Amino acid sequence: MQDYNSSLEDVNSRKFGTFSYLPAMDAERIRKQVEYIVSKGWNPAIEHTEPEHAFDHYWYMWKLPMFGETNVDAILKEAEACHKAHPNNHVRLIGYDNYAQTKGAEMVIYRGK
Amino acid sequence: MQDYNSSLEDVNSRKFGTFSYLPAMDAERIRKQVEYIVSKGWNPAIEHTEPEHAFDHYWYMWKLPMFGETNVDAILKEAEACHKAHPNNHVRLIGYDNYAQTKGAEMVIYRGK
Amino acid sequence: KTYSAGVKEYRETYWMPNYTPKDTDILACFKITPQPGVPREEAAAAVAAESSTGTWTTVWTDLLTDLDYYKGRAYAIEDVPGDDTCFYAFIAYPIDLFEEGSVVNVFTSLVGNVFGFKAVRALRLEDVRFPIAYVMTCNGPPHGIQVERDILNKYGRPLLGCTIKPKLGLSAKNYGRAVYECLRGGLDFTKDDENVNSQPFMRWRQRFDFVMEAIDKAERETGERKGHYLNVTAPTPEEMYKRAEYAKEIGAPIIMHDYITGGFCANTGLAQWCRNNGVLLHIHRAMHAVLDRNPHHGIHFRVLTKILRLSGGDHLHTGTVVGKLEGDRQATLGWIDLLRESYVKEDRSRGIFFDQDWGAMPGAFAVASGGIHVWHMPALVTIFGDDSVLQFGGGTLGHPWGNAAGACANRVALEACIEARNQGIPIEKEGKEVLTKAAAHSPELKIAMETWKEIK
Amino acid sequence: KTYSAGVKEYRETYWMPNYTPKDTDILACFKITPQPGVPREEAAAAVAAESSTGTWTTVWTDLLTDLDYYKGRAYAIEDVPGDDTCFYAFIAYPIDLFEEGSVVNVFTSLVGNVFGFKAVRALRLEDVRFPIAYVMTCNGPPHGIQVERDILNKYGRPLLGCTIKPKLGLSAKNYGRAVYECLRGGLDFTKDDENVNSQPFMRWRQRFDFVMEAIDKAERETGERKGHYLNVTAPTPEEMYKRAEYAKEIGAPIIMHDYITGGFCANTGLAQWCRNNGVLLHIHRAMHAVLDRNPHHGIHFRVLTKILRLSGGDHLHTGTVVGKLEGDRQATLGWIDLLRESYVKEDRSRGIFFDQDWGAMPGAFAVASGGIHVWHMPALVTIFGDDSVLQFGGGTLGHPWGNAAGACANRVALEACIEARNQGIPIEKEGKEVLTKAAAHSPELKIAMETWKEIK
Amino acid sequence: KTYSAGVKEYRETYWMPNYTPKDTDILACFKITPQPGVPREEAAAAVAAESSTGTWTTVWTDLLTDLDYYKGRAYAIEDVPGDDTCFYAFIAYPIDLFEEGSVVNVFTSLVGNVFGFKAVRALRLEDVRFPIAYVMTCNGPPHGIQVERDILNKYGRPLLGCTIKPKLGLSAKNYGRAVYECLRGGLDFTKDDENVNSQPFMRWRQRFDFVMEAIDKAERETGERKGHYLNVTAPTPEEMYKRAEYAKEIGAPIIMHDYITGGFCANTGLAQWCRNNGVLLHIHRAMHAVLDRNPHHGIHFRVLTKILRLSGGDHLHTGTVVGKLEGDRQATLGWIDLLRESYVKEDRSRGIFFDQDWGAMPGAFAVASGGIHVWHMPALVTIFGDDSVLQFGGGTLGHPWGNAAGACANRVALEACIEARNQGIPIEKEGKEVLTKAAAHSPELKIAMETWKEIK
Amino acid sequence: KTYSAGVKEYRETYWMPNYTPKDTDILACFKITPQPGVPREEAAAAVAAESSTGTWTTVWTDLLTDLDYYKGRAYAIEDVPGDDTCFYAFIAYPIDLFEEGSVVNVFTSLVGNVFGFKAVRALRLEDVRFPIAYVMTCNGPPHGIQVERDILNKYGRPLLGCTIKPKLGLSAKNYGRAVYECLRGGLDFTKDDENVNSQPFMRWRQRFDFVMEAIDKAERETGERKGH
């Protein structure tokens, strides 16, 4: 029986949506998520934000959503480019579902701070 | 005739409920309070919080309340474990009165900051 | 039954010695000092008739309804232990006689006119049994003890308060300065005096504003929740509600009302308002001694305690036991139980003539006040227990070092007494040594103990 | 001038035998039965201090204000004629101590806590001098005697009323039938009993509706304006105002309130509402005997009369003089004068310790009720005069021929007494012959006189 | 035609086998168990007549209007696959028969009286076709799935909730502590039990306050948006709206209503209020099993699902599929589609007798709850998909390490199942291995898996 | 008194055959058709648990409160006369469990979820004892029989009513004409059908207006009070 170990002062207590309660995604896990987004026909997109502003509804869009993009490697290189340009920012991978007009998927693939 | 010596900037001016106007409790006084809680039939519990958040209604629960626990030494060791895990936090000892659904007792047994 | 005009005795109809009270009946105990020559049963039946459905002469309209049901009836007479000039009469009233959720109606019915009846020399309402069915129609305390402790985040000890003195004459800013010093010293509450409503020297809005300024500063300084009973007692209900609304607007956690002088109607309305708006309600019992002091005429304070609990209040002034006789001490303990407990058993030694069931209606804090100081801390802690508010008006402002030091002295004395009680020390037996050991670490407490003499 | 902590006697500060009361001071007379060993001046000063600005121990905040001005002071002590265990203390309070237009505040200040003070065995507030400056801040009666007579178009005689009996148990329609019979018989008013608010057997809206039906029928039948005091006494001010608003909506000319049990706050609010809405306000004095009966403890009814006149009421129950002692007769005449007159001079024989100036504040009708019947008509007419309401609850419904005949008998008796008084007959000396000559033409009056015994 | 008084059979007028339903007709399917001796067509026509415009005997007012148009008509009869004691009757009602935007009216018309008709032994409303023209008159969900996900900023997974247990008995502060622990553990939502409205042990305002305190603390601690379905189900609509308004005032993102026990009128009003005030509406289906459990009598839950979607709700409890029959599995999938999809095609295997067009009316979250724990995570994720709320009341509070650990275990299980599903793993086939691999990194999940038995 | 996680049976806590109902308890009689193999006491205790304070697995928050008081308890089981597939379970609920003056709350608590519980094949709520203490918290009928007779001035007989037919399809004026003819013939009341609320062929304000026109004409014609 152990204490849960979450607190207001512990910065590791902050979570960032889907898959933030799992171990940080490696390259193989990120690629499988990109493949899932493409398989659904969703439009991949990359957003990023400073960790202090992660609660905001709107993160910074990295360029434009890669509409109609099915090349997994191209999506991965865009996410990596955003990570290099903003190494201290959380980087989110998004699959836009234009038919439901929702984000079919959203997950932080590069954790900041 | 002396000045009262309390101010907004002096961090020692902050108080933390019952027995905070008395000298900091030593081991024997803490044991006597635990014995009182047990004798009342109340359920011992340990909470803790960062000193800046001591005003909050909800502190962090240290594990679960030791329901039906009458071993004073076990309660003391749980409080000591909470203190060791969070040495900078205030640690509060609580006796839950389940019949009145109130805290029959609540006192900071380990002062932080 | 037929209509026969003329005057008839009350005994044959309103005296039923074989009546068994129903579980829904309101029961009343009247200590009756009858007029000489009037038999006991006639006096009891007269009280029952005049309090429920009786009239001095037979009226035909009685036959349009079921008087056998609706009437109040005296069902028992007992001797008063000791005094033989009076006797106890027990009267039962059907629950149908009263408007639901109206302490105003029950009070008016019981005490409206029987106290001036010529058949009795004197009359004292000793106790009233409110059936649980009637209790559940009343709002009761807006929050009660447990909810209030949760709101204030204060546990394991009585709360500490202080009425600001002088009762009148301070400007709003000076008043707020006194409030701030008291609260920063360690008191949980400060209090408007009962006659502080809105005076030319301190208009109520200014007092509310500066009190809230003081509360905010003290809370930031000490890190403990603070309050001040802002008196909303007002000439009219509109004014009372306006002051309550402003107190809510500025974030006041607690307000105060004089429920006897303001009246039960205004008090019940205010208690419901407090429930609807999440504001604690402190009840001051001004004028109680006009009603309850005389042992042979008036209304015993335990009845007023029950009435207040039904009408609504989170705190109620219950008086201090210090300096009272054993009978008075027992009566005080009884009405404290009536104020705070879920069920109070009949106890003739305490003057509790009826079992009082409160069901799930929460209890209110018992408030001790009046000429008390640090030397009273042990006794108070022993008598009232945790679920009480101890108010030190003069005992805080009369400290030689000012309000903050006096508040700290009172807080240290209370916490020392509480810790010693938790450790198993007999606090009332040896309060001097507990206080002295505490004062060894508190100069404020030491000089406070020197300021006022020991009481024994 | 300097702060010295500790307990000091009240006599040196709050006893000023050379003080001359100001024209704006509120003056109070307290009959004090002091605790043995306590000197008279100490007791009077203690009463003054505890009622105005005093505290049991010296507080430094006193020096932030002008205590010499704001304090209440005892300025005179007199012996009570007869009894030597008590004495009269006269205390002056500056007008600044009180909220303007607040009988609640003045009452709370005067009677809030001094009645429980340990220095006195017993305490009775005998009289209060309200300065004209304070009187003009109070609303007073919503209409007063003259405005009410103009509204009702009734002149040259006392008004006649009747409380519907039994006090409780009638359905709304049966209640209205009784009201209709009374009003058609010749009464000006009918009245809800003090405890008729809204009961399960007769909810208030139904009672209001059927009462208005009865009033309309009786007014059409007799061609005279009729009324029924609809009781708006309610658990909360919101409910009280709702019932008052409905009474106004259905055209009720007059409503009723129990100003002591309902409370002064609700009553003052209702009086202002009645002024704003053109509805007459009848005030019932339920619970008065709890306060005013005991000659050594409590509040004399003349104080309550002044309070009611300031708070507001068009009628006030003043009690019946018949069967009272000579001192009680004089006291009753005194408080009737206080209720109705523009200026009442000091009269120790009547217990009027102060000149009371009412300025232009109108007086209220004095209401006589309680066990009275036709044989009381002469005395009542002699005692109360024209500006009164005589209420015959049992005396009307207890008539052998029903409410209409009893109302006619009461009306004939009143009109015969009034005509004989106008003709110069000594009505109280020869009331039997006036009533007999009247009964020669009124069978209802004849059988009413046979129903109840002659009264001397 | 002409007026001929007397009783006539329903079959000749209300049975039209050649009728082609219009695109605006409301269509109903009734499983009829007829009384012996009654032919199928007579029973179907009786249901149609009693549900739309019929009467037991001919009335002349019939001829004042065009009941050839207004009447409901049975147009088809089919055999129930399997059971031969009952048959399906398809009835068409013109859209003019119903008040626009009133599920109350449509429900009352369809189920008001036909279920007690003597011509049938039993009756079950299986399905109702709401034409798009009628659908567009209804408010529908205040926000719907996509708007809710945007408000909460939660995508790509089912939401996680938890009802606080015990259902009753917790004080407001203890309740809030439980809420805080659950939310800080990783749950999106906590939930009031359906019977938590305002109890003596926890009044609603206190619960709302402490829940909001818990929500704020958890949101600050985790950085994720949190909510708690505050139950606004109340005795009266005024009380319901008061509680909803207070929830909005304190910033509550979501409230809850029991739409069957509270009623469709209150629920529709609350859904419109939620749209007007931007508050999410969680709908609890208490009492549903009284209506929908019996396979031969009552109202199938797919009808109640359509009714709720029209009346308005952002979430709806749809039940858990685990432990259901194959037909029950398919029926559950069908009504989940009815709750969430824009268009649902007829599918007899799912019990969907009609194509249901929802147009642009958004769908609501499907809520899974009831005796579920971590071992159910795979199946749930497979059955409900992303647009669902999975509620673990006991599965969170019943964790051996408390609410935070149980919430973390449920969150880890959900996220592991979602990631594995996104990776292409067959989650329902191999849920044990996915959960075990997840538990390798989550001690909370490991001990949760040990706490409750594996499900297969 | 100690927290032990896991699933436990309902019978040991929620079945109290020696419990004597209090005068303030809400009592319920459930006709339980139990699932085969489930003992009667377990079925009765399951109904008591799920309707008051129970949960499918032990939760630690139970120990923060007095479960021995707040719980609903089955205190008696009887055989249904005749049918043996079902039995009567009598369950007592403390009055504290319910919001005062809320039939919504009491109804939700009793019938909210137990009717779908797996342990029972079928369940019928036969009777509920509302203690007088709870009854007095409810508003009850706005007027009741005696007040209504006084309002309507009708005594010594049942009142006569009539629902206007056809249930739907009449215009407001034609509806009012039918109302007038009924009322003038001697009926005390006419009645809207349950599904007459506000339809395109007869909007409610129009129906209300012409009904009142009909009522006034019938009252003047007959001299008796009429209603619709």
Automatic annotation (TrEMBL), chains A, B:
<dbReference type="InterPro" id="IPR000894">
    <property type="entry name" value="RuBisCO_ssu_dom"/>
</dbReference>
<dbReference type="InterPro" id="IPR036385">
    <property type="entry name" value="RuBisCO_ssu_sf"/>
</dbReference>
<comment type="subunit">
    <text>Heterohexadecamer of 8 large and 8 small subunits.</text>
</comment>
<comment type="similarity">
    <text>Belongs to the RuBisCO small chain family.</text>
</comment>
<dbReference type="InterPro" id="IPR024681">
    <property type="entry name" value="RuBisCO_ssu"/>
</dbReference>
<dbReference type="GO" id="GO:0019253">
    <property type="term" value="P:reductive pentose-phosphate cycle"/>
</dbReference>
<feature type="domain" description="Ribulose bisphosphate carboxylase small subunit">
    <location>
        <begin position="15"/>
        <end position="112"/>
    </location>
</feature>
<protein>
    <recommendedName>
        <fullName>Ribulose bisphosphate carboxylase small subunit</fullName>
    </recommendedName>
</protein>
<comment type="function">
    <text>RuBisCO catalyzes two reactions: the carboxylation of D-ribulose 1,5-bisphosphate, the primary event in carbon dioxide fixation, as well as the oxidative fragmentation of the pentose substrate. Both reactions occur simultaneously and in competition at the same active site. Although the small subunit is not catalytic it is essential for maximal activity.</text>
</comment>
<dbReference type="Pfam" id="PF00101">
    <property type="entry name" value="RuBisCO_small"/>
</dbReference>
<dbReference type="GO" id="GO:0016984">
    <property type="term" value="F:ribulose-bisphosphate carboxylase activity"/>
</dbReference>
<keyword id="KW-0113">Calvin cycle</keyword>
<keyword id="KW-0120">Carbon dioxide fixation</keyword>
From TrEMBL, chains C, D, E:
<feature type="binding site">
    <location>
        <position position="369"/>
    </location>
    <ligand>
        <name>substrate</name>
    </ligand>
</feature>
<feature type="binding site" description="in homodimeric partner">
    <location>
        <position position="113"/>
    </location>
    <ligand>
        <name>substrate</name>
    </ligand>
</feature>
<feature type="binding site">
    <location>
        <position position="193"/>
    </location>
    <ligand>
        <name>Mg(2+)</name>
    </ligand>
</feature>
<dbReference type="Pfam" id="PF02788">
    <property type="entry name" value="RuBisCO_large_N"/>
</dbReference>
<dbReference type="InterPro" id="IPR020878">
    <property type="entry name" value="RuBisCo_large_chain_AS"/>
</dbReference>
<comment type="subunit">
    <text>Heterohexadecamer of 8 large chains and 8 small chains.</text>
</comment>
<feature type="binding site">
    <location>
        <position position="163"/>
    </location>
    <ligand>
        <name>substrate</name>
    </ligand>
</feature>
<feature type="binding site" description="via carbamate group">
    <location>
        <position position="191"/>
    </location>
    <ligand>
        <name>Mg(2+)</name>
    </ligand>
</feature>
<dbReference type="InterPro" id="IPR017443">
    <property type="entry name" value="RuBisCO_lsu_fd_N"/>
</dbReference>
<dbReference type="InterPro" id="IPR036376">
    <property type="entry name" value="RuBisCO_lsu_C_sf"/>
</dbReference>
<keyword id="KW-0479">Metal-binding</keyword>
<feature type="modified residue" description="N6-carboxylysine">
    <location>
        <position position="191"/>
    </location>
</feature>
<feature type="binding site">
    <location>
        <position position="167"/>
    </location>
    <ligand>
        <name>substrate</name>
    </ligand>
</feature>
<keyword id="KW-0120">Carbon dioxide fixation</keyword>
<dbReference type="InterPro" id="IPR033966">
    <property type="entry name" value="RuBisCO"/>
</dbReference>
UniProtKB/TrEMBL annotation, chain F:
<feature type="modified residue" description="N6-carboxylysine">
    <location>
        <position position="191"/>
    </location>
</feature>
<feature type="active site" description="Proton acceptor">
    <location>
        <position position="165"/>
    </location>
</feature>
<feature type="binding site">
    <location>
        <position position="193"/>
    </location>
    <ligand>
        <name>Mg(2+)</name>
    </ligand>
</feature>
<feature type="binding site" description="in homodimeric partner">
    <location>
        <position position="113"/>
    </location>
    <ligand>
        <name>substrate</name>
    </ligand>
</feature>
<comment type="subunit">
    <text>Heterohexadecamer of 8 large chains and 8 small chains.</text>
</comment>
<feature type="binding site" description="via carbamate group">
    <location>
        <position position="191"/>
    </location>
    <ligand>
        <name>Mg(2+)</name>
    </ligand>
</feature>
<comment type="function">
    <text>RuBisCO catalyzes two reactions: the carboxylation of D-ribulose 1,5-bisphosphate, the primary event in carbon dioxide fixation, as well as the oxidative fragmentation of the pentose substrate. Both reactions occur simultaneously and in competition at the same active site.</text>
</comment>
<feature type="binding site">
    <location>
        <position position="194"/>
    </location>
    <ligand>
        <name>Mg(2+)</name>
    </ligand>
</feature>
<comment type="similarity">
    <text>Belongs to the RuBisCO large chain family. Type I subfamily.</text>
</comment>
<feature type="binding site">
    <location>
        <position position="163"/>
    </location>
    <ligand>
        <name>substrate</name>
    </ligand>
</feature>
<feature type="binding site">
    <location>
        <position position="167"/>
    </location>
    <ligand>
        <name>substrate</name>
    </ligand>
</feature>
<protein>
    <recommendedName>
        <fullName>Ribulose bisphosphate carboxylase large chain</fullName>
    </recommendedName>
</protein>
<feature type="domain" description="Ribulose bisphosphate carboxylase large subunit ferrodoxin-like N-terminal">
    <location>
        <begin position="14"/>
        <end position="134"/>
    </location>
</feature>
